[PDB]
Amino acid sequence: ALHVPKAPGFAQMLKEGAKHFSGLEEAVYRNIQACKELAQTTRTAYGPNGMNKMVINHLEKLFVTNDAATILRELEVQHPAAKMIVMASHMQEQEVGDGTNFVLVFAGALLELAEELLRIGLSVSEVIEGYEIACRKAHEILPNLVCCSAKNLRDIDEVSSLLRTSIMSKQYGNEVFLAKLIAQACVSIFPDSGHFNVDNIRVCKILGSGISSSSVLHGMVFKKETEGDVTSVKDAKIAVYSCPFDGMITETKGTVLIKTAEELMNFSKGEENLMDAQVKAIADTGANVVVTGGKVADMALHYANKYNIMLVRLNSKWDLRRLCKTVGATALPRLTPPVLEEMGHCDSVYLSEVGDTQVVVFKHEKEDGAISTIVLRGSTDNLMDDIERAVDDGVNTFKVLTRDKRLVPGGGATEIELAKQITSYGETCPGLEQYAIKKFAEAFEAIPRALAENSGVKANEVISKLYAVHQEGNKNVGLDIEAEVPAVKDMLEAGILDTYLGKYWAIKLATNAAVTVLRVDQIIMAKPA
Amino acid sequence: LAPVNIFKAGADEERAETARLTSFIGAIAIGDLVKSTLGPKGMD
Amino acid sequence: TPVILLKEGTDSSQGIPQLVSNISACQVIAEAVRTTLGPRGMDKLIVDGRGKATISNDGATILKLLDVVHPAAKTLVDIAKSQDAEVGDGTTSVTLLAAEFLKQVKPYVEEGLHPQIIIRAFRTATQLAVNKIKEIAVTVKKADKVEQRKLLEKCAMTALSSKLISQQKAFFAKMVVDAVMMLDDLLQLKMIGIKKVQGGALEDSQLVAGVAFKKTFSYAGFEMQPKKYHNPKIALLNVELELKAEKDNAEIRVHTVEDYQAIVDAEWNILYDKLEKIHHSGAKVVLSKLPIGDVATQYFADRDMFCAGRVPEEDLKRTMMACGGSIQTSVNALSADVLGRCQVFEETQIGGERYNFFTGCPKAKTCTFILRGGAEQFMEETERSLHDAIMIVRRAIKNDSVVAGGGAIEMELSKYLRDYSRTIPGKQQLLIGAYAKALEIIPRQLCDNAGFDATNILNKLRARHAQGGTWYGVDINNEDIADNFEAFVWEPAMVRINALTAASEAACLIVSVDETIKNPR
Amino acid sequence: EYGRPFLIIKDQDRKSRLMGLEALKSHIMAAKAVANTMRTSLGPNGLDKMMVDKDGDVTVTNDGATILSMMDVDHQIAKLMVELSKSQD
Numbered sequence A: 001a002l003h004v005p006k007a008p009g010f011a012q013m014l015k016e017g018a019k020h021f022s023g024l025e026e027a028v029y030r031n032i033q034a035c036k037e038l039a040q041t042t043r044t045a046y047g048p049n050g051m052n053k054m055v056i057n058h059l060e061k062l063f064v065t066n067d068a069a070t071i072l073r074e075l076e077v078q079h080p081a082a083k084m085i086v087m088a089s090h091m092q093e094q095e096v097g098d099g100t101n102f103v104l105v106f107a108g109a110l111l112e113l114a115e116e117l118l119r120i121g122l123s124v125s126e127v128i129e130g131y132e133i134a135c136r137k138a139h140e141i142l143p144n145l146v147c148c149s150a151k152n153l154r155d156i157d158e159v160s161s162l163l164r165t166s167i168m169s170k171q172y173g174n175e176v177f178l179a180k181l182i183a184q185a186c187v188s189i190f191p192d193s194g195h196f197n198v199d200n201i202r203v204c205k206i207l208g209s210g211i212s213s214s215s216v217l218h219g220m221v222f223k224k225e226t227e228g229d230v231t232s233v234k235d236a237k238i239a240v241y242s243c244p245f246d247g248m249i250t251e252t253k254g255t256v257l258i259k260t261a262e263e264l265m266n267f268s269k270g271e272e273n274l275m276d277a278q279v280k281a282i283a284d285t286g287a288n289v290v291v292t293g294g295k296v297a298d299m300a301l302h303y304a305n306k307y308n309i310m311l312v313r314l315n316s317k318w319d320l321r322r323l324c325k326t327v328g329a330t331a332l333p334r335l336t337p338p339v340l341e342e343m344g345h346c347d348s349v350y351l352s353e354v355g356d357t358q359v360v361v362f363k364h365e366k367e368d369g370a371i372s373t374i375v376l377r378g379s380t381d382n383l384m385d386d387i388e389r390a391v392d393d394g395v396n397t398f399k400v401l402t403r404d405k406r407l408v409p410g411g412g413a414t415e416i417e418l419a420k421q422i423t424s425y426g427e428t429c430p431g432l433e434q435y436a437i438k439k440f441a442e443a444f445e446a447i448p449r450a451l452a453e454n455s456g457v458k459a460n461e462v463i464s465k466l467y468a469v470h471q472e473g474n475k476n477v478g479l480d481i482e483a484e485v486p487a488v489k490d491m492l493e494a495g496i497l498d499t500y501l502g503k504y505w506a507i508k509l510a511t512n513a514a515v516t517v518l519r520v521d522q523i524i525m526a527k528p529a
Numbered sequence B: 001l002a003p004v005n006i007f008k009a010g011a012d013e014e015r016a017e018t019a020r021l022t023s024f025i026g027a028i029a030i031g032d033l034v035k036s037t038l039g040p041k042g043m044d
Numbered sequence C: 001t002p003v004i005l006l007k008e009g010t011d012s013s014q015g016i017p018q019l020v021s022n023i024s025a026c027q028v029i030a031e032a033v034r035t036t037l038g039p040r041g042m043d044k045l046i047v048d049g050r051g052k053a054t055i056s057n058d059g060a061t062i063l064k065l066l067d068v069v070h071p072a073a074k075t076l077v078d079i080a081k082s083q084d085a086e087v088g089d090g091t092t093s094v095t096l097l098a099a100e101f102l103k104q105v106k107p108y109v110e111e112g113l114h115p116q117i118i119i120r121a122f123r124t125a126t127q128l129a130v131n132k133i134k135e136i137a138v139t140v141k142k143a144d145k146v147e148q149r150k151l152l153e154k155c156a157m158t159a160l161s162s163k164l165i166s167q168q169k170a171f172f173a174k175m176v177v178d179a180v181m182m183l184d185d186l187l188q189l190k191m192i193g194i195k196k197v198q199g200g201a202l203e204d205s206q207l208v209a210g211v212a213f214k215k216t217f218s219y220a221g222f223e224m225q226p227k228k229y230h231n232p233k234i235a236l237l238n239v240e241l242e243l244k245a246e247k248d249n250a251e252i253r254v255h256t257v258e259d260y261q262a263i264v265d266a267e268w269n270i271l272y273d274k275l276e277k278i279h280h281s282g283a284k285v286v287l288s289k290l291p292i293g294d295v296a297t298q299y300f301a302d303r304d305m306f307c308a309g310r311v312p313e314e315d316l317k318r319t320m321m322a323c324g325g326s327i328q329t330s331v332n333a334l335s336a337d338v339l340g341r342c343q344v345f346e347e348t349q350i351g352g353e354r355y356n357f358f359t360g361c362p363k364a365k366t367c368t369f370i371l372r373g374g375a376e377q378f379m380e381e382t383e384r385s386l387h388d389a390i391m392i393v394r395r396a397i398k399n400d401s402v403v404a405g406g407g408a409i410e411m412e413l414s415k416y417l418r419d420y421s422r423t424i425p426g427k428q429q430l431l432i433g434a435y436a437k438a439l440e441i442i443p444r445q446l447c448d449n450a451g452f453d454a455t456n457i458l459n460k461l462r463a464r465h466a467q468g469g470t471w472y473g474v475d476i477n478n479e480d481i482a483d484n485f486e487a488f489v490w491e492p493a494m495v496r497i498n499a500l501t502a503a504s505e506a507a508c509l510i511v512s513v514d515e516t517i518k519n520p521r
Numbered sequence D: 001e002y003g004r005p006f007l008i009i010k011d012q013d014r015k016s017r018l019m020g021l022e023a024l025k026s027h028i029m030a031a032k033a034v035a036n037t038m039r040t041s042l043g044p045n046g047l048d049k050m051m052v053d054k055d056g057d058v059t060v061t062n063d064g065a066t067i068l069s070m071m072d073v074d075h076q077i078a079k080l081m082v083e084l085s086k087s088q089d
Ligand SMILES: Nc1ncnc2c1ncn2[C@@H]1O[C@H](COP(=O)(O)OP(=O)(O)O)[C@@H](O)[C@H]1O
Pocket: A045, A046, A047, A048, A050, A068, A098, A099, A100, A101, A102, A165, A168, A169, A170, A410, A411, A412, A451, A479, A481, A496, A498
C-alpha cells in the first residue's frame, strides 16, 4: 500500500514525541470527558451514606478515607483539565476547609451540560457569558436564604449542635460524641478577642481501646521519658532553656594550655565546682522542673538529681514554643538563673503510661488555658487518622463560624431553591444566553441526586417531591435519610445546617474552574521526561 | 540414603565401606609414591 | 483514549466482588492461627530469608512473622497488635471473632443489602454484649490480703495452660505473683530482669529477690581478689578509672626536664587520688559503666576489694533500685547515704557462664529471673509465655473482676443476644441473630482442637444455658461439660471486653470499603 | 465474583508449606537419621569420625558434641539436636 506522508509546515517542524491538539472535536470534547470521568470517580463518597475508599500510594502506604481532598492528593492525575479541577478543589480546601466534593460535582455537571449546548449550536463565548450571569445572580440570591444564625460561640451545647453536622457527614453514628469532644476542646481555648488560631489544638494518638475512650486534656502531653530520677511534681515552677544543658564553650576553636602541674591537677576540680555553682544558683530560685531543647551532660544530670530537679528534654524547636505558650515562660538562650517574669507555672507535671506508651503530661485545672490536646484511642492507625481528619474539619468549621455567623439549610434545600429561582430568572431573558442560564440552573440538582443515589432510593421521585413542596413556599425542606421510602423533611427543625461562606466560595471557585476549562482552544504537549 | 535431606548442597558423607576404601587407597598411594627413594641405591 | 486520566499501571476494583474478595482473604488469615487455641493447641515454625527459625504459639508473633501484604488482611494483624499492647493476652480470639463475623454476614452482603445496616447492627450488638459482661462480672469488695493472692494465682495458671510450660504452671505462677507484688506502684516492666543460661532443666529456673548479671570483661589481676562478701558496701559510678589524657582538647608545652618529670608524676597522682577517695569511703564492691583499667584492677585486688566495669545501664539501674544507692559521676562527695548495701554478694558458675549475685536486700523493689532450658528457641518461648502471665497479673492487680472461661461467657452472650433479637422486627433481627451465632466459634474450635464431637457438646451447652449454670464450659479431660467457675478457670473481664470492641471495629471498617485503587510501583 | 488468584503473602509463589501428620513424620525421620549416624560412636568399642573443614582441615574425633557442631545441616530438627548436645556439653 501507500502512506499519507505528512502535512507541510508545523506538522513537519514539530518535535518527536510532542502532541498538538486543536479544534472542538480534538480538545474540548476530550477535556469534558476527562473532567466527567474524574467527577464520577469520587461521586460515590458524598453525603452521610458515602462509602469509604482505600488507596495505596507509590510508597506502599495505605489510606482509608472518604475525604475528597485526601483522595485527590493520593491519586496521581495525568490529564491537565483534571489537574486544574484538582487545584480548584485544593484552593477551596485551603480557603475554607470543607466542600471539596461539591466543587468537583458542580464542575463536572457544568461541563457535561455545556457539551450538549455546544453540540446543538451555541459557541463557547455565549456559554461563558451565560454562566457568568447566572453565577452573579446566584450570589445575589444566596443571602436571602440565610436562617438560624449563630448566637453564642461560648456555649458548649450550642457549639456542639452547630458542629454536629460537619462531623456527621463523615462519622455516621459517632457524631454526637465527636461533636461533644471537639466543642469542649474549641471552647476551652477561645479568647476574649475573636482571634482563634487553628494551630492551638493538638492531636495525640495512642494505640489501645476503642474510640469511645478518647479524651481531652487542658495542657500538653509528649511521647517521651523523664531523663532524671524525679518523676512527679505537684505544684511545678518551670524553667525553659533553648541552649543545651551543659557548660558552654567558645565559638572559635579553643585549647586548654598548661605549663605546670598544679593547673593539670586543678582543672577538672575547678570545672566541676563551676558546674555545681551554676546548677545550685538555678535551683535556689525555686524551680522544680527544667526543660531543655538540646544535649544534657552527665555532671549536670548528677547535680540536678542531687538537688531534686526534674529534667525533661524535648526537641522539635516547635514543641518548645508550644510549651512556652502553654505554661507562660520565655525560652532563655543562655544558661542563667531565671527571673520571675521568665518563670512558668504549671499545676501537675508527671510521667504516666497508657497502652504500652510512656508519656509526660503537663496538666492544668484551668478551663481556659492557652492550648488543649485531644487524645484519641483506636484499634487501627487508619481509623485514628480518619478520626483526626474529622476533628480537623470540626475545628475548621468552628473557625469559619467565628469568622461569620450565618447558616443556611442543607440536604439539597438550598440547591433546589437556587435552581428554581435561577430558572425563573432565566425564563425572562431574551437572547441566546437563556439556554446557558437554564443549564446552570439545572446543574444544581446533581447534589440532591448524588445524596439520593448514595442513600439508595429513586432520585427522580425525591427531586419531584422537593420541587412540589418548594412550589408551595417551604424553603427549608430537604432529603430524608432515615426513611426507606423517598421522602422529605424540614431541615431547620432537624438541625441540618451549613455555613454560608463555604457555599459562597464553593460556587465561585467551581464556576471559575469550569469557565477556565472551557476557554482553552488548542493544546501543545512536550514529550514526558 | 533417607528421602529427607540433612545437608547443604555440596556437603558429602561416606559410610563404612567407602570410607575404609578411600582411606586405604590414599595411604597406599602415598606409600607407593615414596617407596622408590629407599636404600643405598634409591633414585631422585 | 488519546490522553488517559491516571497513570498506566493503576489497578481498580469496585462493587460486590471486591468486598467478597476481602471477606475471603480474612478467612485465610484466620486459618493461619486457627489450630493454636486451647489447652490442646499446637504451635508453628517459621523460617525467614536468612535461615533463622522461630517456633511460636503466640498469635501476634505468628501474624507479625507472616508477610501479609493484603490491605484488607492487614487489619487483622493490626487488631492483634492492638490487643497485645493493651491487655497482653487474647490475640487469637479477636482474629477468630472478626473472621467469624465477616463469614457470617457474607451472604447478606451477597444479597445486595446495604452495608450501613450491618454496621448499625454490629454496633448495637457490641454495646449490648459489653454492658451484659460488665453486669454479670464477679468481684469481691473486701476479700482479704490472702484472698487477693489466690485470685492472681488462678488467673496466671489459666493464662499458662496452653503454653509450652503447661506442666509447671503451678511452679511458675507463684514466681510471677511474687515478682509482681515486689514491684512499686507504677508496675514498670523494665524493673524485671529475664536471663537465659543454657543447660539444665526447666525446674532449675529460679527467681532472685535482688539482682544478678553476667560477668563482664576483666584485665590481669581480676583473679587475685576475693569472690564472696557478707556485709559489703557498694559504690555505683559513672566515672572512668584508668590512666588517660585529661581532655582531648588539651596540650602541654614545657621547657625543662624537671617540669617534664613533674608532669609525668601528676597523672599518676590524679588517678591514685581518685582511687584513695573511693577506698576511704568503706565500699567493698565497685561497679562502673565505664572501663576499669588494669592499674585500677590491681590496686583494688591488692586491698581485697571487688571491681566491675562496663556494666550495662539497665543492670546498674536495677542494682541501684535493689540496694538503695545513687549513681555518682564524682568521687568527691562519697558519703554513706550514696552507698548501697546487700546482705550477701557472690560470683557463681551457671552452665558454662559466670554470674554476679547480689541477694539479701529486704527493701528491694525489683527481682530477676534465671531461666534454664535446652535451646535458644526453648528459652525464647519460655520468656514469651512468662510475659503473658506478667501482663495478666498486672491488669488483675489494677482491677480484680473475673469471669469464667472455656466458652461459658460466649455462650451466655450468645443466649442473651438471641433472646434480645426476637423482640425487634425487620432485618435487624436477622443481623443480630447472625452476630449471636458468630460468638460460639470459640467452644467449637476448642472441641475441634481437642478432638471431640463438637456438635453434641455445643447442643448440651445450649440446652444447659437456656433452662436457667451461667458459668458452664467444656471440660477437656472429662470429654464433657462442667462448671468452669468451680473448676478455677478464670480470666479478667478486660480480655473479653477488649476483644469484642476490637473485633467489632475491624469488621465494620472492612465492610464500609467500596473500592480499592493501587498506584504504580 | 470469580475468586481468581489473589495475592496475600509476599513471594507467595516461591514459598512452601507442610501441615498435619506429614510434618511430624518428616521431623521423626530427620531425628532418626541423626541418631543413627551418632549410634556407632557409643561405648569402649565404638569408632570415631573424620570431619573435613570448609578449608580442608582434618579432625578425627569421638566427641558427639564436636561432631554435631562441625556438621552443617539444613533441617531445623537437626539443628535442634545439635543445640541439645551442646547444652548437655
Ligand atoms: N443528616 C444529613 N442529612 C442530609 N444531608 C446531609 C446530612 N449531613 C450532611 N448532609 C449533606 O452532605 C453534603 C456534603 O457533605 P460531605 O459528604 O461531607 O462532603 P463535602 O462536605 O466535602 O461536600 C452537604 O451538602 C450536606 O448538606
